Amino acid sequence: APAERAELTVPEMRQWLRNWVGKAVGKAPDSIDESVPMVELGLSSRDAVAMAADIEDLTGVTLSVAVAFAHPTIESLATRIIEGE
Hints:
Blueprint: H1 2-5, H2 10-25, H3 45-59, H4 65-70, H5 74-83
Helix pairs in contact: 2-5
Domain Carrier: 7-85
Organism: Mycobacterium tuberculosis (strain ATCC 25618 / H37Rv)
Protein name: Polyketide synthase Pks13
């Protein structure tokens, strides 16, 4: 149904994260590795704070340390933000 197709998807969430990280570190979003720990991507601490705020504005999810470090890669984090437990 229309409202089901309407929801933010895992591919969209992955794309949003690659775009966010790419802008923050000055790299093409297509080049961002979705399989490495996000603490290895070159973000500053303030970048992490800003990205968390932006995720909250995009989805309403206030990302916990527990959830984030349990899904510490772009691809796993994106899946968990969208699909939940």
